[PDB]
Amino acid sequence: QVQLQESGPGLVKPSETLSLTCTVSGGSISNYYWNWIRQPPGKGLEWIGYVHYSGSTNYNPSLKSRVSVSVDTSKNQFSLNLGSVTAADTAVYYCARQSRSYYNEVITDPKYNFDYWGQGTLVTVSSAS
Amino acid sequence: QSALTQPASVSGSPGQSITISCTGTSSDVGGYDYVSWYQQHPGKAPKLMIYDVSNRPSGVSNRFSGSKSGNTASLTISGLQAEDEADYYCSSYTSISTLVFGGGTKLTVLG
Amino acid sequence: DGVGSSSGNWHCDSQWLGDRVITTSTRTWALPTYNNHLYKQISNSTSGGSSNDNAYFGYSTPWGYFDFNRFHCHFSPRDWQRLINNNWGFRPKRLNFKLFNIQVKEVTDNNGVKTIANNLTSTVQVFTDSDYQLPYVLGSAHEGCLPPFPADVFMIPQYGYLTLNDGSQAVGRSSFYCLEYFPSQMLRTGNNFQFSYEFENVPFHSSYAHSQSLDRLMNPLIDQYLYYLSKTINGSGQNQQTLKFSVAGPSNMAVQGRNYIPGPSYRQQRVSTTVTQNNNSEFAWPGASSWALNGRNSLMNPGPAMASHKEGEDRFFPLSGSLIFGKQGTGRDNVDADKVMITNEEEIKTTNPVATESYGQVATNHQSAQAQAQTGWVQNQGILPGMVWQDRDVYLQGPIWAKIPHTDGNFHPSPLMGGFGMKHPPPQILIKNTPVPNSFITQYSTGQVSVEIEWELQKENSKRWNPEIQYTSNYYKSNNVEFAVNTEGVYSEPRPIGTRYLTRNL
Amino acid sequence: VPFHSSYAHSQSLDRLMNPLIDQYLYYLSKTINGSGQNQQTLKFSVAGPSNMAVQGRNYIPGPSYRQQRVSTTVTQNNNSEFAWPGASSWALNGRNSLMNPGPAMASHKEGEDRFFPLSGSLIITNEEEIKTTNPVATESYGQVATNHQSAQAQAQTGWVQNQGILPGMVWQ
Amino acid sequence: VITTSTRTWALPTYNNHLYKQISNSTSGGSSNDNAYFGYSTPWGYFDFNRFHCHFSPGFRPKRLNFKLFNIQVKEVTDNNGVKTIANNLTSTVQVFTDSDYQLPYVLGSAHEGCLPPFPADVFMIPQYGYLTLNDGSQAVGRSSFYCLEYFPSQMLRTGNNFQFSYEFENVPFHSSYAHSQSLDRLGRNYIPGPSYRQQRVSTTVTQNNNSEFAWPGASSWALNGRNSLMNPGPAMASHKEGEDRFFPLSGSLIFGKQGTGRDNVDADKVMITNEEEIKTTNPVATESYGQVATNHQSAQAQAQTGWVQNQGILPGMVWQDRDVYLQGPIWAKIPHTDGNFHPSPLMGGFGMKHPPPQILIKNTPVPADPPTAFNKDKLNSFITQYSTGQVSVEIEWELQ
Amino acid sequence: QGPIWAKIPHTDGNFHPSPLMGGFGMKHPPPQILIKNTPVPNSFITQYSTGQVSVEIEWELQKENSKRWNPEIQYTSNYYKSNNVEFAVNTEGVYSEPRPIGTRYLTRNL
Amino acid sequence: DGVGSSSGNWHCDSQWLGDRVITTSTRTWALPTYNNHLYKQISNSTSGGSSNDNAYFGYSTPWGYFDFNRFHCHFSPRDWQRLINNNWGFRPKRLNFKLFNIQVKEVTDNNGVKTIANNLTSTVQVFTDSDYQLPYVLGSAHEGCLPPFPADVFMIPQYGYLTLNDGSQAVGRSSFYCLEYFPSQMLRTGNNFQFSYEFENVPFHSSYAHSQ
Amino acid sequence: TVTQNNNSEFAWPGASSWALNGRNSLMNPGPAMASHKEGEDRFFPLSGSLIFGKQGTGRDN
């Protein structure tokens, strides 16, 4: 039983950096690829990017400039840092886990099908308090 | 990249097979057999119904099935029930090794 | 022979020779003194026994006994892998038991501190029941067996037994047993004890999963010459009765005539491991399949061998249907679901009905012009001629043998918790500290035990083209190696391991 | 032929355990935390001497075909003619045949000797010697679940009146 | 008694010498109960499993002998617009027996394609294919695939022959008698055999209910979520004495009359057998087994009973098996399992753990002209071809 | 899918002749087998031949002696639900090999 | 021996015996006629060979060769699993080759349609190079080996070889080889060909991964 | 992943080769060497690792 939990501030003022952490419990980070997905309320999913314990990352081309994803193997948690946010960045942020690959035979990049998911956290980007 | 294109909603009567489709460009969908389908109940995280175009994980019934023709992949739900109403998303691996999702599709069970 | 000469060596290893395996296990044990050398009556009312179904009467004895009746006693995880990946079947042949390097200690409190030293004249009594005259408690899946990991030292269990009762009181037909009435051997610190046993002929425990399902045995390309009744009416209207017939063929496989039917069922309730989709009421006992004997209700556990769940439903398990093991370091009462490990019997679904499903239907009446056809669900089905079934699987943690109760008759004596049923199983080995004087010297003994079982193998002959499923270890990097001790030195078994990986045709 | 058994078991089928020791097996103790809404849980506990009913057992009692229970005290018995309608029977080629004596079953529960199976005894001998391995002729073999429980459905059971042979049965 | 037969066979070439996945979806889909997954092979096989193969219009088989000879390989072309059937002498035919029972055994399902009952007929050899584990139409990881090429086989040109002898394992003599007496007419020491009730259907349509109950009213057993009709089922008497117009819905074998249609044919085109011979020791298929007490009587409680719709084995039962028919099967293979009870197959005949082996045959593919420049792909271009020859099978029977 | 043997080139010297694409280097590998259609008459009859070939190799094995306690990594097929069984033919009858399979799973001490 | 008597049976299977494995594979092959029976010079400039690194000079011959160098020739996937999961090392010992049930066909276009029929007098030439005098092309991981699946019929590859060159031109040290100069065996539709080989002693391939 | 790789045609111009009699041969597969560091699945060493085609793979590009 692997459980993911997102945590972080629920409110972010525009043009400030957004930060979230997912803490995996029951299972270690291991060789898995950790992903961030966001769903704007009433709209479709969108993939932010992933991180790997080797420090490898891959980002969404539209967000590639202002986004960063970090991993901490010691604390068993990985993070999301999204800079220069606007109101278009209000969404529910999920952390997910790329499905385990049963074969070590070939060298390939990960193909994304998610095995586990966090519950998600709502993050509102607004000027008001 | 450009998102995958889906019908906004599809409905059917319980017991009747239903087919949802997602259209993608040659590079993103047409190009590789890596298309996933997720159902999301309201307020829940998406669940993986189908991966690698036609494969399905342990824990998913026969009733869910998927197929691919050209630039369009389709999800088929046979003998659908009440619990089968949710939002279904098409996911695809792209040429530059990025993930792209469909717009989402809402399935309504008439009754 | 002497106090300064060791009476036996340390043998642990496995020899894989052809069709046979020889597994030797040697453990270090410690035996205390139980009940201060006093046979004592025990019953439920001593603890209050508020339930009639819980009523028992029996005795607790000073003697200890050795129990090697679990598999991880004799097999390392690696050796268990070699067994299950390469073999269709196995079964024990010979047993060889040795007890040596006995040491006795005397416990004294001098001033405020405790003192222990060698008592070189003390003896230990040990005997085997080879006529099977004592109550046989080994086949009850009890705790206290030799440890899975050889570097652990374990505490011999205290022997005991039960007999007839009415409520908590005994009856005129009840029995009592003095183990001292059995001739036993007495051992000083230079003596050693050994004997050899011969397993009676038993069937190989099948360790494979069928690659065909009982209802798919047909040729998919050819019709059957047999006919079935396709239509009882021509269409909608009045007085439409008809009889139509069709060939049973590939287009409709449900109705074909078949030579064999799945094994018996006794239905279990179905529990989901996702709690929110479980009824919000306490149904652990009220909703459970049971059998009544002499006015007492016993839970049906694990029960007949039946598949755990339908294909595609992995979150469902029979309420009392399967064997549940605890994870290392799990509390005795009311632990969480994650702590326990629930085994599943999905491999035997090809021939056995699903434990949570009705066996089928039967017609409940005679149809007529005034009466529609009526059916009802078969919740339990005894044996019918032409049934086939698979037994329950054996696990690294599970029992090996049981003793077939001595009765006028039995059917398919194979035990329900898995393993090899035997009328003369490996005999019980009883042991105690000889009392040294109702005031005695506080005393305990320790020593070694080695056990050697010879297993016969059934090799895998299959012509299957594509590669098998095999038991393997995932290559993911983790904090601790599976089936190995952690930083604090605790050995643990991460999951239950079944025997069924290779396949056969049905 | 086998030697006829002329002895009574000192043990009962369900009591074969060692009373001093726990099993390593677990069972399902609690399905809810407490009273309220959304209390579902799964709790497990070791089967041990404290609760002996729920232990896993290697063998099970023999088959049963239930007989109607009749008291020697006329007052206790129903005031009606149940001699033929009441009696268990098996049908062959349209002809009903009373089941006599029937399969071997304990004549009566322990503690009630005034009751005897209607057609189940040789006439009145009592079979109570075999109540260790065999079910009572007047009792149900046990229960089985009749449905799938769910969030909307409570667990339901039903009484097994007759039971055929199962693997792992012993009987006298 | 020694029976001998001989026939002439014609073996086509299936799927251009190719193994092909077949499934529920391959055949058009739509039913979970009917879902299947498997393969079809280029191979054909011989099936003599019906009695009328060995017989002209207590006993049990003992020995078997099989011969295959007079091999003739025809090659077919289209020259202009006409087809030309020429002998090909150099070509071969491959045959092997599976005597280790390593392949799926399809001979026990009462299939068509048997040797014909009339010794002068020429029959087509049916195709070999098998089913494996499925989930819906899809296959699971445990499913297996067999390449029959991976067995050693004997290759036969036109002068070559093939023979082997088989030995039946000891089985009980089939009973071919009806007891003069009945169980209850002999307090009783024995009780009749087990029952699983079938719905009752009358050959007079006006008697039967005016509703569609072919599947709904049918006795079924569920396995892994798939319902299967109980057919023919346990051995039971077809009807009570005096009613011959009723028959158990799925409870009896049904054969077709000569030239009978495949679908939705009326009752006069098919022969519905009756088992009434066994009604002495066995319960009637459409009747309950008996009645049992459902409660404890008391001053306040009348005695209540209920009907036994199905009954498993009880100590002291006796029963008769299902009868064999000149059109019926001979043997079946006992599935390889931990345990079974009274393995005699339900459609009748002799159950065996090592039944007569399967015999597999195909025309060795002969390629057409390859190109003159090297290419790595496999050859899909072959000479249209089929073969024919003679099949003789001998069985020594023992009588009581 | 890989090669089995290679022929060690015939030279004055070599070091660790084991071939670089893998397999067993040999100075006298299995010999070449050459074949042709005998010409039947620069104008000939257009002609081709067909037949069978059988080959039998005897392989010697080195058994695994290890004392490792915990279970090995093994090559296994996952329990999956897919349209096609791995290492088998599809509906059109085409055989395929899903992934390259290496030889190295069991372990040894260094 | 005869036109109507088969010259050999079909053997495919593996026998696992103790420390040894015996893997037998039998395939159906088809051999065309290459280069219209003509040894032909080939070089890069024929295709233009624009790169100097690509420059070659050699010959293409009418012959064909049987290639079974790849592993899936001899092992099914299942048998490959049994090998790699249970064994630390392996190596070949003996080789046994058989060629039988030869059939020759003649191709004719009659009117507008093509015709093929048995030629019972035709022969096939087959020989092994056991002195290793010919250029050895097997060890270059080339295509044309027996198909992994036994139910496929395959096309024998056309033999060829290269020799020294400077650019696309040959040199005085270059060589030429006429395979007809080798004594070979000739086979009619009743003949069959076989020989046995002995692998030289080689080290076990190490099918294991270090744990340290 | 293609985005990490440099945006230039370095397929031949960046490859390890050996020269013989004035001709450059690519070094393939070359000496036996591990394909990548631990935890670096994406990277492959150019000509260093054997590459097989899947069933039905096109001959060129």
Q: Do chains D and F touch (3 or more CB pairs under 8 A)?
A: no
Contact list in A for residue B102 (CB cut-off 8 A) is 44
Q: What are phi and psi of C276, to 5 degrees?
A: -65, -20
CB within 8 A of C498, min separation 6: which ones?
A: C84, C343, C347, C393, C395
Rg (CA), chain F: 22
Greatest alpha-carbon pair distance for chain D in Å reads 63
The minimum CA-CA distance between C484 and chain F, rounded to whole Å, is 7
- Tell me the three state secondary structure of residue G35: helix
Give me the residue label for tokens 């075999």: D130
What is the token pair recorded at A25?
């419990």
Q: Residues of F with CB below 8 A from H52's CB?
A: 1, 100
CA nearest neighbour of G92 among G71, G107, G78: G71
Residue type, G98: K
Closest to E144 (Cα-Cα) out of G72, C251, F77, B54: F77
Among C231, F82, G80, CA closest to B33 = F82
Burial of D137 (0-12, 13-18, 19+ CB in 10 A): buried
Answer whether E305's CB lies under 8 Å from E289's CB.
no
Residue E277 is assigned to a ligand binding site = yes
Method by which this entry was solved: cryo-EM
Q: Is E394 annotated as a binding residue?
A: no
The alpha-carbon gap from F75 to the nearest alpha carbon of chain E, in Å, equals: 14
Phi, psi of G39 (to 5 degrees): -55, 130
Helix (H) or strand (E) holding E200: strand E200-202
Residue labelled with tokens 């990594």: F73
Final resolution, Å: 2.8
| Residue E152 and residue F56 in contact, taking contact as beta carbons nearer than 8 Å | no
Interchain CB contact of F102 with A (< 8 Å):
yes
Q: Which residue of C has its CA nearest to A30?
A: C477
Q: Residue C262 in contact with residue C306, Cβ under 8 Å?
A: no
Long-range pairs of D1-10 with CB within 8 A, sequence gap ≥ 24: D2/C408, D5/C408, D5/D172, D8/C173, D8/D129, D8/D130, D8/D132, D9/C164, D9/D132, D9/D133, D9/D172, D10/C163, D10/C164, D10/C173, D10/C174, D10/C175
G28, amino acid identity: T
| Cβ-based contacts of H23 with chain G (< 8 Å) | 52-53, 55
Amino acid identity for residue E338 in this structure: D
User: At a CB cut-off of 8 Å and minimum separation 6, what does E377 contact?
Assistant: none
Contact E125, E387 (CB under 8 A): no
Residue E326 near residue C239 (C-beta atoms within 8 A): no
Report the alpha-carbon distance of residue E76 to residue C370 in Å, rounded. 63
> What are the E-state strand segments in G39-188?
40-43, 57-65, 87-110, 113-118, 124-129, 153-155, 158-163, 185-187
* Tokens representing residue F79 in the block: 């329990």
Provide φ and ψ at A61, rounded to 5°. Answer: -50, -35
Q: Which residues of C touch G (CB under 8 A)?
A: 18, 82, 85-86, 462-468, 470
- The total of other beta-carbon atoms located within 10 Å of residue G42's CB is 16
- Asked if D163 and D64 touch (Cβ cutoff 8 Å), the reply is yes
Supply the DSSP symbol for C154.
E
Nearest CA in chain C to F88: C466
What six digits make up the tokens of B75?
């999800």
Q: Give me the long-range contacts of E238-241 (CB less than 8 A, separation at least 24).
A: E238/E273, E238/E274, E238/E275, E238/E276, E238/E284, E238/E285, E239/E274, E239/E276, E239/E284, E239/E285, E239/E286, E240/D93, E240/D94, E240/E279, E240/E284, E240/E286, E240/E287, E241/D93, E241/D94, E241/E276, E241/E279
Cα dihedral across residues C77, C78, C84, C87: positive or negative: negative
Residue C73 three-state SS: helix
Look up residue D37 and give its DSSP letter.
S
D101 preceded by cis ω (within 30°)? Answer: yes
Distances (CA, A) of G158 to C252, G137, G150: 51, 11, 21
Q: How many of the other CB atoms lie within 10 Å of CB of C434?
A: 17
* Residue C447, both tokens: 């020593």
- G87-110 and G205-206 beta bridge pairing: antiparallel
Task: List, in order, residues 6 or more apart from C164 with CB less than 8 Å away.
Answer: C57, C170, C171, C173, C174, C175, D9, D10, D11, D12, D15, D132
**D and G in touch (3+ CB pairs within 8 angstroms):** no
Query: Where is G83: in which H helix or E strand?
Result: helix G77-86
CB contact under 8 A, C469 and F77: yes
Residue C131: Cβ-neighbour burial (10 angstroms; 0-12, 13-18, 19+): exposed
Cα–Cα distances in angstroms (integers) from residue C418 to residues C110, C146, C487, in the given order: 51, 19, 34
The Cα G7–Cα G100 span in angstroms is 6
For residue E87, give both structure tokens.
Answer: 């002998």
Cα–Cα–Cα angle for E387, E393, E398, rounded to 5 degrees: 170
Contact indicator for G8, G102 with CB cutoff of 8 Å: no
Residues of chain B neighbouring A94 (CB-CB closer than 8 A): 45-46
Instruction: Choose among G18, G78, G82: nearest Cβ to C465.
Output: G78
> How far apart are the CA of A69 and the nearest CA of chain B, in angstroms?
15
> Which of B55, B58, B83 should we substitute to test contact with C (largest number of C Cβ atoms within 10 Å)?
B58
The two three-digit tokens of residue D67, written as one number: 């007989």
Interchain pair F22, H50: CB under 8 A: yes
Q: Which two tokens stand for residue G12?
A: 């495919």
Q: How many Cβ atoms are within 10 Å of G112's Cβ, its own excluded?
A: 6
CB atoms closer than 10 angstroms to residue G94:
15
Cα C262 to chain centroid distance, Å, stands at 23
At C441, the amino acid letter reads I
> Mind telling me how many Å the CA of C337 is from chain F's nearest CA?
24
Secondary structure class of E236 (helix, strand, coil): coil
Assign 3-class secondary structure to chain F. Answer: CCECEEECCCCCCCCCCCCCCCCEEECCCCCEEEEEECCCCCCCCCEEEEEEEEEEEEEEEEECCCCCCCCCCCCCCCCCEECCCCCCECCCCCECCCCCCCCCCCEECC
Q: Which two tokens stand for residue B7?
A: 């019908």
Residue E150 main-chain phi, psi, to 5 deg: -90, 5
Tokens of residue E196, six digits: 């699983």
Q: Which residues pair with E137 in a beta bridge?
A: none
Residue C420 has a CB neighbour count (10 Å cut-off) of 23
Contact residues for H43 (Cβ-Cβ < 8 A; gap 6+): A107, H35, H36
Distance CA H5, CA C442 (A): 77
CA distance C373 to E72: 57
E391 forms beta bridges with E7, E68
* Closest C-alpha among A126, A127, A117 to residue A47: A117
Of the candidates C219, C203, C8, C199, the residue with the CA atom closest to the CA atom of residue C103: C8
Distance CA A17, CA A13 (A): 8
Q: Across the E/F interface, how many CB contacts are shorter than 8 Å?
A: 53
Distance CA C322, CA C308 (A): 7
Tokens of C204: 């190989």
CA distance E229 to E218: 7
- CA B43 vs. chain centroid, Å, equals 19
Largest CA distance in chain C: 104
How many beta-carbon contacts under 8 Å exist across A and F? Answer: 9
- Asked if B99 reaches chain H (Cβ–Cβ under 8 Å), the answer is no
Main-chain phi, psi angles of C85, to 5 degrees? -80, -30
Q: What share of chain D is helix, strand, coil (3-state, %, to 5)?
A: 5, 30, 65
Least Cα distance to E205 among E268, E278, E138 occurs for E268
Query: Which backbone phi and psi does H11 adopt, to 5 degrees?
Result: -60, -45
Q: Would you say G199 and F96 are in contact if contact means Cβ atoms under 8 Å apart?
A: no
Contact indicator for B86, B40 with CB cutoff of 8 Å:
yes
- Dihedral sign for Cα atoms in the order E268, E269, E272, E273: positive
Distances (CA, A) of E391 to D69, E47, E164, E365, E386: 67, 11, 12, 22, 16
- What residues of F are in contact with residue A105 (Cβ under 8 Å)? 99-102
Beta strands in D19-125 (DSSP E): 26-32, 40-46, 60-61, 64-65, 69-71, 89-92, 95-98, 115-117
Among residues G155, F62, B82, which one has the least CA distance to residue E376? G155
The H or E element containing residue D171 is: strand D169-171
Phi, then psi, of C109 in degrees rounded to 5: -100, 110
Residue C46 DSSP label: H
Which one, of C231, C243, C373, lies nearest residue E199 by Cα?
A: C373
> Is the distance from CB of G196 to CB of G128 less than 8 angstroms?
no
Give the integer Cα–Cα distance in Å for D104 and D101: 8
> In chain C, after which residues is the C-to-N distance over 2.5 Å, breaking the chain?
437
Which pair of tokens denotes residue C455?
């297993």
Chain A partners within 8 Å of H5 (Cβ): none
Residue of chain E whose alpha carbon sits nearest to that of B15: E30
Neighbours of A38 (CB within 10 A): 22
Q: What's the gap in Å between the CA of C467 and the closest CA on chain G?
A: 4
Touch test A–E: 3 Cβ pairs or more under 8 Å: no
C306 burial type by CB count under 10 A (0-12 exposed, 13-18 middle, 19+ buried): buried
CB contacts of H22 in chain G (<8 Å) are 52
**Listed residue (E149, E158, E42) closest to G10, CA to CA:** E149
Q: Of E59, E331, D65, which Cα lies nearest the Cα of C259? A: E331
Name the packing angle between helices G77-86 and C77-86 (round to 10°): 160
- Which residues, including other chains, have CB under 8 Å from residue C410's CB and lie 6 or more apart? C404, D59, D168, D169, D170, D171
Residues from chain F contacting residue A108 (CB–CB below 8 Å): none
D171 is in an annotated binding site: no
- The alpha carbon dihedral of E206, E211, E215, E220 has a sign of negative
Q: What is the distance in angstroms between the Cα of G149 and the nearest Cα belonging to chain H?
A: 12
- Which of H41, H44, H46 to probe the A interface (max A CBs under 10 A)? H41
